[PDB]
Structures are given as structure tokens and as C-alpha cells.
Design a binder for these strands. Structure first.
Ligand code: NA
Ligand code: NA
Ligand code: ZN
Length: 327
DNA sequence: CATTAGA
DNA sequence: TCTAATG
């Protein structure tokens, strides 16, 4: 957590690179396990040799570890850090839409900068178009104060279209967080579940709503179960307009909510831990359900959920307010 | 890890 | 169809 820190971060830096700038999937996977195991080791790595003892630890990285151990750096790390092309890829990346593959592509084409990207908006797809267009605002955080504002409106039309709707704004937001990165709206309806062969319109209806009123302003991607967009709060009585913000709404079979809700609510650790517990408590948790374990090794049969509570009750735990779902 | 775009 | 990108 700190005794092995530098090792892990240099390693990851090492890892990441192969992955993006190079197409070294394996090298990259390599760096990661090591960077993983080296992380668990309860003692100060004092040397390669030491490190090497480990699993996934080979000559290659051990070699790396000494250099870093001995001198507070790493050339290879210093060189890449320096490398304009590679720099370039990591940069181009931030563009919503832009991935390693494209990054590389644009780089080879000569598009290394923001501006380069403008000059060639043609070379970009809608997604990137937008991404481009709202790069600043996409990078900005979302003050909960806004989260509230936004949530308020969202719940309003949801209600407005059909009163039979159930929306929940999941994630860190849900968890109290001072700020958030994008709003997540989990959605469902009784008239939709596991079997009831859809009603794409279900999702459609609402998105359309939000737009009709100007909450939604761009569509990154609109599917029959997962809308992915952009939104903005009516810029008041002037002098202050709201930054463009990322939004995701998703349809869910009413029969799958709570778990999903539970789940999307995190925290990553709260989850993992609760989940770990369900196992002992003879169960299985996952993004859509909760199944009872059968000694044979495994088992099925999705227990019925009507609330965050049912899951809780199930694994005989203390209802945790989302507030304290931190871990 | 599953959903969407796109070509 | 596959491949990329988001989460
Ligand atoms: Na080893
Ligand atoms: Na990106
Ligand atoms: Zn999101």
C-alpha cells in the first residue's frame, strides 16, 4: 500500500505504456500481474532478486526493479515520459471517443493536438465530434449541488411521461460524494422484466422527454436499453450557463433493479465485500440477481428482490445506507 | 463485460 | 462481421 508503492506505480506506468503506445497486450498483461503481486507482498522489496522470487516476476522486471531501487528513476520510464508520440497518444486519449487504436491512427496521420483535431473534424466520428466539442466540460467534475439540480429535473419528466417509472441516480452520487464525474440513471418499469420481451419505447419515451425540454442535448449513443448522452442545466437568468455534462440512462427489467441498483451504487469495495459475504451466507450476488448456493459446488435459482433490503435480509446483514456504503 | 457504432 | 470505445 505504500511499502511497495514506487514499485507498483513505475510498473503500472510500465504496463500502461505497452498497452497504449505499443500494442504489447502481453507485456502489458505481464506488467500488471507483477504490479499486482508485488503489491501484496508484505515486506520491502530490497532487490530484484527478492522481487523475482515472486510469481510473474521475471528477469525482465526484476531488472527493472533494481535500477529503480538503486537510482530513484528508470530510463525507460524517463524516455517514454519524454517521447512526443507516446505523449501524444495519451493525450488524444482524453477525447471521449478516442481510444488507443484511434490515437495511434491520428498520430500517424499527424494529428497530435487539440487543434489538429479541429482542423480535421472530418476524420472524426459523431462520438468524437462531441467529445471534441465538449472536451473541457467533459473533463470537469459535477458539483453534487448540480447533481441534485439535475436529478430533480430528471425525476420530473420520468414521472411526467408515465408515473409507472422508477429512476434512481446511482454511483458515488447516491453515496453522498461531494462531486461526481457523470450522472448515472438506472431505469425500470413494471411493464419490463426478465422475459417480457422488451418495450424499447420504454427507454425511448424518456429520452425523448428530456430532450423535449432541453435537458438532453446530444446523443453519443442511443440503444434500446442503454442511452449514453450529454446534458446541461438551463443556464439561468444569464451571466452563467452550465457546463456540458455526460449522462447515461439504462433500461432494466423491473425484476432486476435493486441488485443492479445495489451494485452500480458501489463502492467497488463495498460491493466486493458484501458479495464476498453472500458466499459464506450461502449465496451469490451479481449485477442482476442473487442466487442460493448448492453444495455440489454451485447452484442457481434467483431469489426474488423488491428492495435494497431483500438482498440485505438475504445475506443477513445490516442495512447499510448508501451513505456508508463506502466499504 | 456488455452494449453501441461503424465500416 | 468484426473491431473499437464506454462503463
Ligand atoms: Na517467479
Ligand atoms: Na477517451
Ligand atoms: Zn456513466
Amino acid at each position: 500500500e505504500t511499502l511497495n508503492g514506487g514499485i507498483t506505480d513505475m510498473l503500472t506506468e510500465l504496463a500502461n505504456f505497452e498497452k497504449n503506445v505499443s500494442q504489447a497486450i502481453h507485456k502489458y498483461n505481464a506488467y500488471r500481474k507483477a504490479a499486482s503481486v508485488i503489491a501484496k507482498y508484505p515486506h520491502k522489496i530490497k532487490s530484484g532478486a527478492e522481487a523475482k522470487k515472486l510469481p510473474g516476476v521475471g528477469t525482465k522486471i526484476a531488472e527493472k526493479i533494481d535500477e529503480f531501487l538503486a537510482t530513484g528513476k528508470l530510463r525507460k520510464l524517463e524516455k517514454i515520459r519524454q517521447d512526443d508520440t507516446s505523449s501524444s497518444i495519451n493525450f488524444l486519449t482524453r477525447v471521449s471517443g478516442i481510444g488507443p487504436s484511434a490515437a495511434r491512427k491520428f498520430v500517424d496521420e499527424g494529428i497530435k493536438t487539440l487543434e489538429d483535431l479541429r482542423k480535421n473534424e472530418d476524420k472524426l466520428n459523431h462520438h468524437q465530434r462531441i467529445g471534441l466539442k465538449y472536451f473541457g466540460d467533459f473533463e470537469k467534475r459535477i458539483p453534487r449541488e448540480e447533481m441534485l439540480q439535475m436529478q430533480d429535473i430528471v425525476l420530473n419528466e420520468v414521472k411526467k411521461v408515465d408515473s409507472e417509472y422508477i429512476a434512481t441516480v446511482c454511483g458515488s452520487f447516491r453515496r453522498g460524494a461531494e462531486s461526481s464525474g457523470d450522472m448515472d440513471v438506472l431505469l425500470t418499469h413494471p411493464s419490463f422484466t426478465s422475459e417480457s420481451t422488451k418495450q424499447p419505447k420504454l427507454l425511448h419515451q424518456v429520452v425523448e422527454q428530456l430532450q423535449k425540454v432541453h435537458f438532453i442535448t446530444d446523443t453519443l449513443s442511443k440503444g434500446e436499453t442503454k442511452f449514453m448522452g450529454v446534458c446541461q442545466l438551463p443556464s439561468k437568468n444569464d451571466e452563467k450557463e452550465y457546463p456540458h455534462r455526460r449522462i447515461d440512462i439504462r433500461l432494466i427489467p423491473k425484476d432486476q433493479y435493486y441488485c443492479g441498483v445495489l451494485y452500480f451504487t458501489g463502492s467497488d469495495i463495498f460491493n466486493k465485500n458484501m458479495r464476498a459475504h453472500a458466499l459464506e451466507k450461502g449465496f451469490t450476488i451479481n449485477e442482476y440477481t442473487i442466487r442460493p448456493l448448492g453444495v455440489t459446488g454451485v447452484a442457481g435459482e434467483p431469489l426474488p428482490v423488491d428492495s435494497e433490503k431483500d438482498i440485505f435480509d438475504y445475506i443477513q446483514w445490516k442495512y447499510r445506507e448508501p451513505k456508508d456504503r463506502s466499504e
